[PDB]
Structures are given as C-alpha cells and as structure tokens.
C-alpha cells in the first residue's frame, strides 16, 4: 500500500463528506444488482429478484452499513491494513467461504458510487488514490485465506 502523503490527504478529505450508512447501502445493493453472482452469499436476505427489491431491502441496507463501517475504520489505519482486517479475513475464509475476488468487485463498485455521489470532485487523481485504497483493503481481507 504505497500511498503518498497527498494521496492520503485526498482520500481522507473526501471521506469526511461521506454518509457511510447511505453509501454502504448503495454500494452493497449495486454489487448484488450488477454482479448477481454475488447473491449466492445472501440467500437469507429474502427478495433480491429485481433492482428495487435489492436496493430497498432493509437487510441489504443494514449489511451495507456494517461493511462500510469496517471499511472506514480501515481508513483510520492505512499503514496497517493487514493487522486491522486480520480477524475479518479469517472469518471471511473459514466461516463465510467468500472468494476474495468479490472484495475486488465491491471495491470497484464503491468507486462508481463515490463518483456518482461526488461528480466533478472525484477527479482522476482522487480516483487513482481510491483505486489504491480499495486494492489494499481487498488484499488485506484476502491475506489470511489458506
């Protein structure tokens, strides 16, 4: 995770404007709509048959908040992503059996959501810094797989 000081500031600046609850819901919902394969892990969530069923599903919304909350906390520890996510890594591998490729898909969808919410302000350089962050989080979440 090679982040320059000005990348780190850029990432932090913007994130301060993010309503994590809302963006969490939007990012998880979009993952399940755009990449329906990811629905294999959420069959207990009820109806995911159409976009409105997914996006407005209270369980998808609650899970989105939990996911992005952990992600925010990760942004407070950019210099130790691996330690920060170690127990979540193990959980995702041994208990949930989630193929880590899904972490990369969520990261990209999160980038589209950030662009959607911020428009202009999500300049090419800000996007580049966020691409590094989502890749690092994805790699940290995969690190304990065995």
């Amino acid at each position: 995770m090679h982040l320059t000081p000005e990348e780190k500031s850029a990432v932090t600046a913007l994130w301060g404007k993010v309503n994590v609850d809302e963006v969490g819901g939007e990012a998880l919902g979009r993952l399940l709509v755009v990449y329906p394969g990811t629905q294999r892990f959420f069959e207990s969530f009820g109806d995911l048959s159409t976009p409105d069923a997914v996006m407005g599903n209270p369980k998808v919304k609650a899970h989105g908040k939990k996911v992005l909350g952990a992600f925010s906390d990760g942004l407070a520890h950019l210099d130790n992503l691996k330690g920060t996510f170690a127990t979540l890594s193990e959980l995702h591998c041994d208990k949930l059996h989630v193929d880590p490729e899904n972490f990369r898909l969520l990261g990209n969808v999160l980038v589209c959501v950030l662009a959607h919410h911020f428009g202009k302000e999500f300049t090419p350089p800000v996007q580049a810094a966020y691409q590094k962050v989502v890749a690092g989080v994805a790699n940290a979440l995969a690190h304990k797989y065995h």
Binding site: V33, P51, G119, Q127
Partner: protein, 141 residues
C-alpha cells in the same frame, strides 16, 4: 447477451451523453492512465500530459466507436469487425486491459450522469461494455 431492457437502458444513457462523448472518452482514458499505469505501456508514442491533444483526439475515436456500437446494438460483432481485427493483429492489447478501461468509462459516466446512472442502468452499461470488450478481443488467437 444483452436483454431488451439492457438495450433500452444503454440507448437512453448514451443518448444523454450525446455530444459529450468525445470529452467523456478522453476523461476515461486520463482516469485509466492515472489509476492503472501499466496501461500506458501501449501508448509510448503519445503525449500523456493533462489536456494532451493526442489524448483528446483518441478519446473522440473511442467514443465514436462506442456510439457506433450503440447504433448497431443488434449487430455489434459485424459493426466492430474492423476494430476487432486491429486490436487482434496489430495492437495486441492484453484482454485484462479492456476491463480497466470499461471501469473507467463507467466511473466517467457516473460522475457526469447522476440522475440516469441508476442501479439497473449501471448494470446494463457494465454488460454492454463487457460485450464490446468480448468483440474487440474475439479474434486474438
């Protein structure tokens, strides 16, 4: 395969882009070069500075090809044949790279089309760019 709804979604979205395509093509490329630097290895003969004319000129050509694909959405493999040949025999761009540009195009559209970039449309566009990428890459070996 694109579904009837997917096609409607893509025509609507691209229509709103309208006479901005060129500009959005260029932005997608700048986004791509900055976020995924390995992609620059294919453009060693270009000036890659911000606002570069080569970058703008190339954005327009990419955007024009996408417009042509939207206009021939029921016959994309034939509408893009020449381009498929070019990418396969001369340029020989590794397929992973197409995913990277597609992502950046989506980011570009999301940043400029807030009301239209809904979940269903996002899904349709992703599928559309993936089909365009499969065509451009289908004659590789």
């Amino acid at each position: 395969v694109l579904s009837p709804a997917d096609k409607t979604n893509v025509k609507a979205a691209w229509g709103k882009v309208g006479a901005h395509a060129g500009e959005y093509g260029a932005e997608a490329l700048e986004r791509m070069f900055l976020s995924f630097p390995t992609t620059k290895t294919y453009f060693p003969h270009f000036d890659l500075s911000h606002g570069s004319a080569q970058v703008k000129g190339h954005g327009k050509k990419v955007a024009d090809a996408l417009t042509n694909a939207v206009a021939h959405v029921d016959d994309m493999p034939n509408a893009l044949s020449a381009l498929s040949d070019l990418h396969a025999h001369k340029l020989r761009v590794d397929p992973v790279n197409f995913k990277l540009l597609s992502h950046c195009l989506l980011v570009t559209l999301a940043a400029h089309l807030p009301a239209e970039f809904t979940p269903a449309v996002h899904a349709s566009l992703d599928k559309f760019l993936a089909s365009v990428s499969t065509v451009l890459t289908s004659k590789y070996r």
